Design a protein around this ligand. Structure first.
Ligand code: E2W
Ligand code: E2W
Ligand code: NAG
Ligand code: NAG
Ligand code: NAG
Ligand code: NAG
Ligand code: NAG
Ligand code: NAG
Ligand code: CL
Ligand code: CL
Ligand code: CL
Ligand code: CL
Ligand code: CL
Ligand code: CL
Ligand code: CL
Ligand code: CL
Ligand code: CL
Ligand code: CL
Ligand code: CL
Ligand code: CL
Lengths: 532, 532
């Protein structure tokens, strides 16, 4: 029977699963590592010891230990991103959706969730890969990885807490797909890794890290890049936050061994309670325990690796959403509220500026405000709100990615670039937030195809277009079907720099995505700060 | 008879002059100072010694000694600005157009010509005040003043060449109008001084200088301001250029007395030949001998005087032309030509940038180019040409004036602001130069009213509108006629910052003239240079 699969680690038994008037196979909660509990907290993951018997693979696993958003209790808009399973340090598991009948060798897609490296779950409703596996005849995997301190506490020079271990969690997941996906009908030679936000940053980090390049074929990055200012810290800064975390918990701080033994003693929620207190009073758009530039996982600085071609050469498909700053501001900036139009005075605009560029001389502040202020209309609350939203999105997401795109394309084997700007008809967040960070995911996973989810027919067609782009790219490295004559999504070349709009209108091709602002962010502003 | 007038200096006899199917009276070439010749070269002017007999005042005087443009021999576009009379150091004379019959007490307007303080003549065809005197029933004076080294050689601490003497030339002209214009039918209580470019800068400098404020009632500034970067130098920089001028002429350089005796010996054209060699290799948009911030004529820095209200409080009417950079670039920038469309490569744009900001760190260069570059279309030769034209005009004219306007309006008694953007139908310079610096003057002086000058009927109506604005402002301090209901030219207030367009279309009112660029020029760029 097709719900039984033998693997190099043991037998697993899945469940038949309905999906749009048909059925497919799902294997939920397969372990890919030893449970990182106890004195293994903060350590590199070990491979899952092989098991006897059949592993019930019919129900979702636990989610990892993480902060939980409570800003809007019961609000579906925020709670659709929270853990929907019991939380535990025993959380290193993957899930697989396999078409029925089982294929023999079809392309594989591995989903890497986001959440700023401090949160995330593979079991969210928007991450349910059954629609995509069934519609595009792919084998859909979603992995999990340790977040927060559990996955990214970095005491460099130590082997009990070296940092980046949540990245090694993902890597082991990919190694297990390389080794066992052939038994699920998947082609381990055509594995596409994809992910959004922190997951998009992860994908790019696996493109960069030599110990990861050989475990996948190509890559998709949504609203995230490895060079994003929130996505990595130095070895010094990682050690500082780790010691600062000990201070918060009354820890002996003389050695790394004593620091680590104390932290291993605390219950997980104790660590999470004080997690945000280690950030520098430098503030707001930054998360505590992120990957570290350690010399091992990342040989040198990300910028030098990028400049020298020191990265896997393949095909990539990536892009951004129109409004990437909205959540940063709602949750952390003064004067933004879920239930008002959040119009913003001149005063509040100037304070959000300062929050958006941590540690910038005053001359830099003027540079930013001069660039984003309409001085013919400088007291317009809506323009001030939109301007701040652009500042935050350009700085933290769009312009890092545009830098990555341009650096990568000089050496890679094909780049495709998209600008997603359709606001979902049924979005529960306020209108002023726009085409929000994170709200293309439901289209990539084909949720518009479910009528009771209350999407427009145009949104079903856009989701089908997008799913087909993603899967056709994963099978062949080109989103366009060969001899099917609809408008072509053109290659992104250093010369032309073309991209497309992704929305419900007929495709349009543009050039040089937000080049005006990103010249400012990627070339002018850092020069200004360097020379003052 | 009305061609004879007795003055506190002697009798003068003018000539009857035809003008648009009528006649008026003109008194050309009245001396207002002692001829500044010989050992009086470079000295403060002395009053004209009174004379016996009748002074023939029927023919134009000489023009002062000055550089003469020969870039386009015979080209009327350039030659209409050159001396049209024999040149001489004996050039301190004024000219008066008096309506017929002679008025008893009507308002007076004193024209101060431009020419970068290195050139200019009161006798140019475009400066012929007969049309304005006759049409608006004013008494029109035009003065003259020493230019070049003869008027602005500045060896501070010396009494034989203190600097600013060409400004004292103008002042003496105004003192003579104060004393004698009542005999020509002019009201010495309603004297309006006006002028363009260097003359506009002069007008503002007389508003600033205490020894000048009491000699006129109000003021008009066209395309010039006292704070313009080409309009003044420091005492140190004036001494440097003066000594450098001696080096060029094999002068003894040990003392000021010996420096000055040598320079007084050279024939005037010898000084003019080497005049441009004293500029710092710092270049292009600067003129050699300009006013100096000496502590006498200007008590303190122009910026501190402006900030503290240390200036005459009255009404002012001022404005700019759409394209102020065109001549700077044509004559001095590489890649601009009279007879091509002067489209400009990316390379040449970057070199014109460097020429437009003398002495700017490289970080400042990027600031300028980032602000004026369209990075979606950065190789457009026309946009690159227009961008450079805006850089030069904003920096050297528009944004200094906008700074002056805003500083003055806090303390003055009424400000009116215009943006002149009608290109004359019959302009002989190439189209790419646009609404050129200097080409509103012919409208202010009513030359469109002469049919054989080949202007459109709309240009006759615009000239009449403008002449009426200027004269009504000069009589009453408000350009609008009281109870005549046509659209009103609104006051310029710190809050609203309104101005009007001056062209052949019906008046329109706008707000915050080029505020985006002038925030960059007047606030951001100097801060950037200061802090690097
Ligand atoms: O974005 N501001 C958020 C914010 N929430 C709160 C509510 C309580 C938890 C603090 N947890 C934080 C969260 C997030 N970012 C943070 C950044 C800096 C710091 Cl000190 C804490 C953060 C973003 C994701 C959600 C939580 C208070 C202050 C505050 O600033
Ligand atoms: O604008 N460039 C002009 C320009 N003309 C020439 C032609 C010969 C005379 C030099 N006379 C000059 C004139 C003017 N500006 C100058 C600025 C710097 C210097 Cl060294 C000389 C200047 C502007 C008004 C007209 C003359 C050569 C080089 C040159 O640069
Ligand atoms: C695991 O499998 C059994 C039958 O194989 C099923 O009844 C059970 O519900 C599954 N586990 C849980 C926790 O429900
Ligand atoms: C990708 O590589 C192959 C062979 O290495 C080459 O022929 C092809 O043109 C490349 N495509 C791009 C877009 O670089
Ligand atoms: C679909 O729309 C109706 C109408 O407001 C709403 O009551 C219902 O809850 C929606 N369904 C879902 C699944 O949100
Ligand atoms: C000055 O006046 C006389 C008559 O008064 C006139 O003939 C003469 O032409 C004038 N001067 C010159 C230089 O022409
Ligand atoms: C000008 O001054 C007079 C009296 O000094 C004052 O009443 C009038 O309002 C002022 N006008 C402006 C525009 O400042
Ligand atoms: C007026 O236009 C004609 C036609 O080109 C021209 O020949 C003539 O010289 C012009 N007149 C003046 C004064 O420029
Ligand atoms: Cl199989
Ligand atoms: Cl514990
Ligand atoms: Cl870049
Ligand atoms: Cl849309
Ligand atoms: Cl919006
Ligand atoms: Cl670019
Ligand atoms: Cl009289
Ligand atoms: Cl001589
Ligand atoms: Cl200003
Ligand atoms: Cl017009
Ligand atoms: Cl133009
Ligand atoms: Cl302003």
């Amino acid at each position: 029977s097709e719900l039984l699969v033998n693997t190099k680690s043991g037998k697993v038994m899945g469940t038949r699963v309905p999906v749009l008037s048909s059925h497919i196979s799902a294997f939920l909660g397969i372990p890919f590592a030893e449970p990182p509990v106890g004195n293994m907290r903060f350590r590199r993951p070990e491979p899952k010891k092989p098991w006897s018997g059949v592993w019930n693979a019919s129900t979702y696993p636990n989610n990892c230990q993480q902060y939980v958003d409570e800003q809007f209790p019961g609000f579906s808009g925020s709670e659709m991103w929270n853990p929907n399973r019991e939380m535990s340090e025993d959380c290193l598991y993957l899930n697989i959706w396999v078409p029925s009948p089982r294929p023999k060798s079809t392309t594989v897609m591995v989903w890497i969730y986001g959440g700023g490296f401090y949160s995330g779950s593979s079991t969210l409703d928007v991450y349910n890969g059954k629609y995509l596996a069934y519609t595009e005849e792919v084998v859909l995997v979603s992995l999990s990885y340790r977040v927060g301190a559990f996955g990214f506490l970095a005491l460099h020079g130590s082997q009990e807490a070296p940092g980046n271990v949540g990245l090694l969690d993902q890597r082991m997941a990919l190694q297990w797909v390389h080794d066992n996906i052939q038994f699920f009908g998947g082609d381990p030679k055509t594995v596409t890794i994809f992910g959004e936000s922190a997951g998009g940053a992860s994908v790019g980090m696996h493109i960069l890290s030599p110990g990861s390049r050989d475990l996948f074929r190509r890559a998709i990055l949504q609203s995230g890049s490895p060079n994003c200012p929130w996505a990595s810290v130095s070895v010094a800064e990682g050690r500082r936050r780790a010691v600062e975390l000990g201070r918060n918990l009354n820890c002996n701080l003389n050695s790394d061994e004593e620091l680590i033994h104390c932290l291993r003693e605390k219950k997980p929620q104790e660590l999470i309670d004080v997690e945000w207190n280690v950030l520098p009073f430098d503030s707001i758009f930054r998360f505590s325990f992120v990957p570290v530039i350690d010399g091992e996982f990342f040989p040198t600085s990300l910028e030098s690796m990028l400049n020298s071609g020191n990265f896997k050469k393949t095909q990539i498909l990536l892009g951004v959403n129109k409004d990437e700053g909205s959540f940063f501001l709602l949750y952390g900036a003064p004067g933004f509220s879920k239930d008002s139009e959040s119009k913003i005075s001149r005063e509040d605009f100037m304070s959000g500026v300062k929050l958006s560029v941590p540690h910038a001389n005053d001359l830099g502040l003027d540079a930013v405000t001069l660039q984003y202020t309409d001085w013919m209309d400088d007291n317009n609350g809506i323009k001030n709100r939109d301007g701040l939203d652009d500042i935050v999105g350009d700085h933290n997401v769009i312009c890092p990615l545009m830098h990555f795109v341009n650096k990568y394309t000089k050496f890679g084997n094909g780049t495709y670039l998209y600008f997603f700007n359709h606001r979902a008809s049924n979005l529960v967040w306020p209108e002023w937030m726009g085409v929000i960070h994170g709200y293309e995911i439901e289209f990539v996973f084909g949720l518009p195809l479910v009528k009771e989810l209350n999407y427009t027919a145009e949104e079903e067609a856009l989701s089908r277009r997008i799913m087909h782009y993603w899967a056709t790219f994963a099978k062949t490295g080109n989103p366009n079907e060969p001899h099917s004559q609809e408008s072509k999504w053109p290659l992104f070349t250093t010369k032309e720099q073309k991209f497309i709009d992704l929305n419900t209108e007929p495709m349009k091709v543009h050039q040089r995505l937000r080049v005006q602002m990103c010249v400012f962010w990627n070339q002018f502003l850092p020069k200004l700060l360097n020379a003052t």
